C-alpha cells in the first residue's frame, strides 16, 4: 500500500519523502501527479536547478518544495489546500532521461 496524507482545505499540508542522500547525491528531485495506473506522472514542482539551492522552497502554483541535501529529505508544502489538489502523487529523483520513484503518496483534502 501507500501512505495517505490528509489536509484540511484552506490549510497547509507538509509531505515528507526521505531518500538515500548518497544514492541520489547530485540528482534533483520532483513532485508530480499520477494520472492513472499506467498513466503518466504530470510534473507539479521541481527543486531548484542548482543542486546547492535545493534546500530552499521552489514554488509552483500553491506547491513549494524543499530538499534537505545533507540529511536527505524531500519536503513538499501545499498551502491553501483545495479539493482539486486531491489525488495520488509521486516523489521522484531525476537522473538523465529517467526518474526513480522515492514514494507514492495519496493526498486527500477535508472540509471544515
Amino acid at each position, epitope marked *: 500500500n501507500t501512505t495517505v496524507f490528509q489536509g484540511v*482545505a484552506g490549510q497547509s499540508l507538509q509531505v515528507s519523502c526521505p531518500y538515500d542522500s548518497m544514492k541520489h547525491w547530485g540528482r534533483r528531485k520532483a513532485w508530480c501527479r499520477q494520472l492513472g*495506473e499506467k498513466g503518466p506522472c504530470q510534473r507539479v514542482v521541481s527543486t531548484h536547478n542548482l543542486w546547492l539551492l535545493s534546500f530552499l522552497r521552489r514554488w509552483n502554483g500553491s506547491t513549494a518544495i524543499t530538499d534537505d541535501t545533507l540529511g536527505g529529505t524531500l519536503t513538499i508544502t501545499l498551502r491553501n489546500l483545495q*479539493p482539486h489538489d486531491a*489525488g495520488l502523487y509521486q516523489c521522484q529523483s531525476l537522473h538523465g532521461s529517467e526518474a526513480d520513484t522515492l514514494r507514492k503518496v495519496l493526498v486527500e483534502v477535508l472540509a*471544515d
Partner: single-chain antibody
Amino acid sequence: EVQLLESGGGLVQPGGSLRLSCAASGFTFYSSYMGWVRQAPGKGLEWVSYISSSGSSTYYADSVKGRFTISRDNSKNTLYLQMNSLRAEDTAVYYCARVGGYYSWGNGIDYWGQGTLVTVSSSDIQMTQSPSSLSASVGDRVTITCRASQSISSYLNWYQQKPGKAPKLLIYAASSLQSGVPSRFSGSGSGTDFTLTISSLQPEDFATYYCQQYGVYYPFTFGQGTKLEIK
C-alpha cells in the same frame, strides 16, 4: 460493463436506522472516490455524502451531518450508507455515485446508479437555474443559465436526468463535453454566470438539466434544475 446496484430502500418508521448497500461492478473500485446523492420525489438533486479512495475522508451534507455514516469495502467492492436516527424529511431516492477520478475528484459524477426509494411514514453557495420550466419544440435552439453566488471560475458541471431514469454527466468544466455526448450540446461560462445551449434540438433531449459546483468549494451544491418539456 459498469453497473451500480443499490439495495436497502423501502419504508422505515421515524427514528429508526437503515442501511443502504451499493454493489459496484465493471471498474476500478479502490481508486475512485464514491458518494450518495439524493433526489426528493418530484424535487431537485441534493448531495448526501462522499467518501475517499482510502475511505479515510468522509464528507456529509450539513443536513445529514452527525446522523449518517458513509462506509466502503474495497475487497468486496461495496459502498454503504448507515442512516441512524432517521427523520421524516430524509425521504428521497438515494443514488450511488462514482466520482471517475483516479484518486482525484476528476471531472464529476460520471456513472450513477438507478437509486432506491427511502420513505419514512409520518453559509452556502446558492446555485440558481434560469428558468425552472421551459416548453420547447423539436429543433429549437434552447439556452439555460446557471448562476453562482461567489465566483467558481470554470468548475461547473452539467448533468442530464431523463424522465424517471438516473442522471448522467453531460458537461464537465463548463466548456468541454463528456465522451459520447452528441455534437449539438454546447456548454460555456466562467465566474458566476454559465450557459448551456442546445443547437437543433433532438427528440431524446427533453428532460431535466441540473448544474453543480464541482472542484473549488467543498459544498458541492447542485442546481435547482430546469425542466425542458415539450410544446
